[PDB]
C-alpha cells in the first residue's frame, strides 16, 4: 500500500450544491489518495447502494488505479436504469453502463433540494436520438431531431423535435417523479501502480 497521506475527496462529490443533468453528466477523477468507504456503505442517507463485481464491505482494503465519480440527477423511477445490462430512455440515450461494469451505484432522494413549487425545469434529459449510446459515452448536442422523412434544417415543427426535455420536478410529486441524486463510482485496475487505496 503506497505511503499516501491525502484522503479521497468523496465529501465534495456527495455534498455538492449542484448536480449535472443526466444528458450531460459530470465526471470527476479520484486519484493519489486514501479512499475511506466506511462513511458510504454504512450511511443510512442513501436509498440505493448497489455494487457490481465487488462487495462494499471488502472494498475498504483494495487498491485501484483510478476511481471515477459520475454525478447526475434523474427521477426516482429511472434509478433502476443505472445498471449494467439495462435499457430505457436513460440507459440508451443519456447514460449507459457496460455489461462488465465494476463499481458501485449510489443514489438518494433530493426532493427538498432539487424541487420548487413553481417547478424546477433546470434538469433535462435526452428523449430523441438516432441510435443508442456506447458505455460511458456523453452526448450533449442540441441539434433538431428528424423523426419524419423531410429535412428540418434546424427548424422545429411537424416531425422535427428538440431532443432534450425537462423534468417537471415539484415538491408535491409522487416518489417516482421526485428527483434523485446519483453518483456512480467506476473502479478500474490497470497493469500499473495503484493510486487509490483503503485506510490501512
Amino acid at each position: 500500500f503506497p505511503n499516501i497521506t491525502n484522503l479521497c475527496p468523496f465529501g465534495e462529490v456527495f455534498n455538492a450544491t449542484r448536480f449535472a443533468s443526466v444528458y450531460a453528466w459530470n465526471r470527476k477523477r479520484i486519484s493519489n489518495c486514501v479512499a475511506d468507504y466506511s462513511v458510504l456503505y454504512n450511511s443510512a442517507s442513501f436509498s440505493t447502494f448497489k455494487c457490481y463485481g465487488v462487495c462494499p464491505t471488502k472494498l475498504n482494503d483494495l487498491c485501484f488505479t483510478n476511481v471515477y465519480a459520475d454525478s447526475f440527477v434523474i427521477r426516482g423511477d429511472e434509478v433502476r436504469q443505472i445498471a449494467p445490462g439495462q435499457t430505457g430512455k436513460i440507459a440508451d440515450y443519456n447514460y449507459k453502463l457496460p455489461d462488465d461494469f465494476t463499481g458501485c451505484v449510489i443514489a438518494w432522494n433530493s426532493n427538498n433540494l432539487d424541487s420548487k413549487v413553481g417547478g424546477n425545469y433546470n434538469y433535462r434529459y435526452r428523449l430523441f436520438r438516432k441510435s443508442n449510446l456506447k458505455p460511458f459515452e456523453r452526448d450533449i448536442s442540441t441539434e433538431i431531431y428528424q423523426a419524419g422523412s423531410t429535412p428540418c434544417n434546424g427548424v422545429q415543427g411537424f416531425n422535427c423535435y428538440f431532443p432534450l426535455q425537462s423534468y417537471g420536478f415539484q415538491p408535491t410529486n409522487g416518489v417516482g417523479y421526485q428527483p434523485y441524486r446519483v453518483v456512480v463510482l467506476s473502479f478500474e485496475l490497470l497493469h500499473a501502480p495503484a493510486t487509490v487505496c483503503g485506510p490501512k
Epitope: 497521506t5 491525502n6 484522503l7 475527496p9 465529501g11 465534495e12 455534498n15 455538492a16 450544491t17 449542484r18 470527476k28 427538498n112 433540494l113
Partner: antibody, heavy 127, light 104 residues
Framework: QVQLVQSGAEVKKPGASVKVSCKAS????????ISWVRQAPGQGLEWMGW????????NYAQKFQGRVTMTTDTSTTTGYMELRRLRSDDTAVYYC????????????????????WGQGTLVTVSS | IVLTQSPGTLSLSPGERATLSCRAS???????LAWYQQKPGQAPRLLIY???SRATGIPDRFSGSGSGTDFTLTISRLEPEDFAVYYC????????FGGGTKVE
C-alpha cells in the same frame, strides 16, 4: 477534537503589512479549505477570502483583491493571511475558520459553512 | 446577493420563542445559506447549514427553514445562553453575511 489557534495581537503603522498565522489540528488538513473573516469593533462579519489547502487555489472578496495574499503550509498544517497597505480603518479581529463551502480539490460549491473557527487575531492600525 | 436581517434588536424574555428573519435581494439556493451565533467575547459558531440542517454539537432547540428570498432562524425557547448576535450567510454568489441580529 478540531482546534484552530492564531497569533497574538499586533500593532501596525498605516502603510505597513500584517501576516496572521493559523495553526490547525484534529483533522485531515488537505481535505478542507481555509477562510478568513474580519470583524471591526461593533461591526458584523466581513468575508476576506478562501484558500485551498490542496492545490493553492484562492478566491478573494473583491474589496480585498490586490491587498490580501493567502498561503498554506501543508507540512506544518498552518495557514497564513497577509494584508498589505494597512489603513486606519483596518482595525479589526481577524478570524481563521475551517471551510466547507467550497471543495478543496475540485473548487465547487458545497452544502455547509465555516464549521470550526479560531480564536481571532486583533490587529490595530495607528500612527 | 445582499442579505438583510430584522429586527435589528430582538427583545425577548427567557423561556420565550425567538424568530429571526433574513432576506435576500436575489433568490438564494436553499442549500447555500447558513446561520451563525456569536456570543460576547467569543468567535462565531455554525448553527445551521443548508438552510435547515442542524450543525454538529448544536442543541435540538435550534431549527430553521426557508426558500427563495426569505429564510428564518427559529429558537423554540430562549435559554440564558441563547442571548447572542446571530448572522445569516449565503455563498450562492460569492460569500456574504447579513447585518446581524442581537437577541436581548
Amino acid at each position: 477534537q478540531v482546534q484552530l489557534v492564531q497569533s497574538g495581537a499586533e500593532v501596525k503603522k498605516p502603510g505597513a503589512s500584517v501576516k496572521v498565522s493559523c495553526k490547525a489540528s484534529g483533522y485531515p488538513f488537505t481535505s478542507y479549505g481555509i477562510s478568513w473573516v474580519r470583524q471591526a469593533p461593533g461591526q458584523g462579519l466581513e468575508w476576506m477570502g478562501w484558500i485551498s489547502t490542496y492545490n493553492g487555489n484562492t478566491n478573494y472578496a473583491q474589496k480585498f483583491q490586490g491587498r490580501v495574499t493567502m498561503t498554506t503550509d501543508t507540512s506544518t498544517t498552518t495557514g497564513y493571511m497577509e494584508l498589505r497597505r494597512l489603513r486606519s480603518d483596518d482595525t479589526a479581529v481577524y478570524y481563521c475558520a475551517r471551510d466547507y463551502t467550497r471543495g478543496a480539490w475540485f473548487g465547487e460549491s458545497l452544502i455547509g459553512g465555516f464549521d470550526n473557527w479560531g480564536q481571532g487575531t486583533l490587529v490595530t492600525v495607528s500612527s | 446577493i445582499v442579505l438583510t436581517q430584522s429586527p435589528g434588536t430582538l427583545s425577548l424574555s427567557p423561556g420565550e420563542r425567538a424568530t429571526l428573519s433574513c432576506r435576500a435581494s436575489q433568490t438564494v439556493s436553499s442549500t447555500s445559506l447558513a446561520w451563525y451565533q456569536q456570543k460576547p467575547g467569543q468567535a462565531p459558531r455554525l448553527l445551521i447549514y443548508g438552510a435547515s440542517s442542524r450543525a454538529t454539537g448544536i442543541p435540538d432547540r435550534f431549527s430553521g427553514s426557508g426558500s427563495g428570498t426569505d429564510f428564518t432562524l427559529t429558537i423554540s425557547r430562549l435559554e440564558p445562553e441563547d442571548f447572542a448576535v446571530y448572522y445569516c450567510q449565503q455563498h450562492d454568489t460569492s460569500l456574504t453575511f447579513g447585518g446581524g441580529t442581537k437577541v436581548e
